[PDB]
Structure 1
C-alpha cells in the first residue's frame, strides 16, 4: 500500500506515497459534486484567524451520506474513489431503487458488496444500525452523537471505536482517543473500521508537497520579535526563558487543559483519553 520512491533527487529522498491500489474509479460522480473555494484561514471579517492555511490544490466537495438513513433497501458498492477533502477513501453505493450516494469506505469494503442500514441489518462491515442493535465488542465507525444528525465520530482513515456496554438509554463506547463515553442508544453507527489505514505512514518528503495540501510554513515563536511572540527576542538563540512555553496569543501551551467546565457532556464522559 505504501510505495517508497528511489532517491533520484534530495527532494524525493525518504519520500513515500500510497499506491492507490484500493481506488477503482479515478473520476467522481458529477451529481454529488459541489464547489469548495478555499478560505485560507480567513473568516467573515476577511481576517486571518487560523494560521498556516493557504493555497493548495483546487478541490471539489463530494456529498457524503454520514446519516445512512435509507433503510430496508440494499445498496451495492459500485466503486471506491479518492476524496481530496478527507483522509479516508469513499465508496459510491447504488441502492436498488436507483439512488446513488457516497459513504466513507470501510476497511475491507469491496465492489459488489451489499450494504444495508436499519435495525434489522446484520452486523457486517458497511452496515449502519442504531447503537442499541449493535453487540458489545463490535468495532464501529461513523458514530452519531445526536440521533438523525449523521456520524461525527471515528471518520478518519483507520478510525474505529468499540462498543463496551449498554446502560439504559445510553451505550458505552471506547473511542480511538482512548476516552470511554456514553452515547444515546438511538444514535446510529456503521460496522467496521475506516479504510486507507496506511495514510499516517506516508512520508511527505519535501516542502512543496505540503504546499500542494494548502499548508503554509510555521514560524517558531523563538525566531520572532518580542512584540510578535512571548518567545520573541533575546540576543542570539534563546531558551524559552519563561516558566511555561507560551502560545503566540500569550497562553501557556504545554500541559494546560483547555476543556471548558460546566459542559453537558461531562456526565456522559466516563473515562478521559
Structure 2
C-alpha cells in the first residue's frame, strides 16, 4: 500500500497538524500524516525529530520550524534543509527523502547558495522552496 507523498508543499497559509508518523518501506524513510485546517489530508516525509502534535505550515510566512516549507529566500542562513526545489512550483527534486539535508550558506540577490551534504555547492533561485529539517 504505497502512499502518496506531497513533495510540492503548496498549501500555503493553511495550518496542518502532524497526525501520525510512520515508516514507509517503499521510501526507507518515515512519513507523517498531516491533517490540514481545511479538511485536506496529506503525507510528507517526516524530518528528524518531528513529533505527533506539532503544527506545520508552508509559504513565505511560515515559521522556521522543522517540517515547514518555504521559498529559499525566506530561510535563515545556516538552517538545514531537504526536498529542495530546483524550479519554483515543480516540487522538490533534491534530497526528497533519502540522504543528508543540504544547508543554506548565503543569499545573494535572487539566489540562495546551498551546500549539499556531498560538499557540493549550488546557487538555487530563492523562489525555489525547501523544507526545514534533516532527512
Bin of the TM-score, shorter chain as denominator length:
over 0.9
Is the aligned partner of 1:61 residue 2:26? Answer: no
| Residue 92 (structure 1) aligns with | 33
| Residue 84 (structure 2) aligns with | 143
Q: TM-score, normalised by structure 1?
A: 0.48
Cα deviation for residue 158 of structure 1 reads 5.3
Aligned equivalent of 2:57, options 83, 95, 116: 116
Unaligned 5+ segments in structure 2 are: none
Matches within 5 A, 1:120-131: 120-131=61-72
Any idea what the Cα deviations from partners look like across 1:7-47, whole Å, max 9, x if unmatched? xxxxxxxxxxxxxxxxxxxxxxxxxxxxxxxxxxxxxxxxx
Cα deviation for residue 156 of structure 1 reads 3.4
SS of 2:47 mapped into structure 1: coil
Cα deviation for residue 141 of structure 1 reads 0.9
Cα deviation for residue 121 of structure 1 reads 0.7
Aligned equivalent of 2:123, options 162, 171, 182: 182
Normalized per residue, the structure richer in strand is 2
| Residue 113 (structure 2) aligns with | 172
Unaligned 5+ segments in structure 1 are: 1-59, 195-273
Q: Is the 8 A contact 2:92 2:129 kept in 1?
A: yes
| Aligned-residue CA RMSD (Å) | 1.1
Q: TM-score, normalised by structure 2?
A: 0.95
- Which has the higher Rg, Structure 1 or Structure 2? 1
**Aligned-partner Cα distance in 2 for 1:191–1:141:** 7
Cα deviation for residue 157 of structure 1 reads 4.1
Any idea what the Cα deviations from partners look like across 1:106-150, whole Å, max 9, x if unmatched? 000101110000101111101100000001101111110011111
**Aligned-partner Cα distance in 1 for 2:120–2:98:** 19
Normalized per residue, the structure richer in helix is 1
SS of 1:90 mapped into structure 2: strand
Count of residues in Structure 1 that have an aligned counterpart in Structure 2: 135
Matches within 5 A, 1:97-246: 97-157=38-98, 159-194=100-135
| Residue 80 (structure 1) aligns with | 21
Q: Which runs of 4+ in 1 moved over 4 A?
A: none
Higher relative contact order (CA 8 A, sep 6+): 2
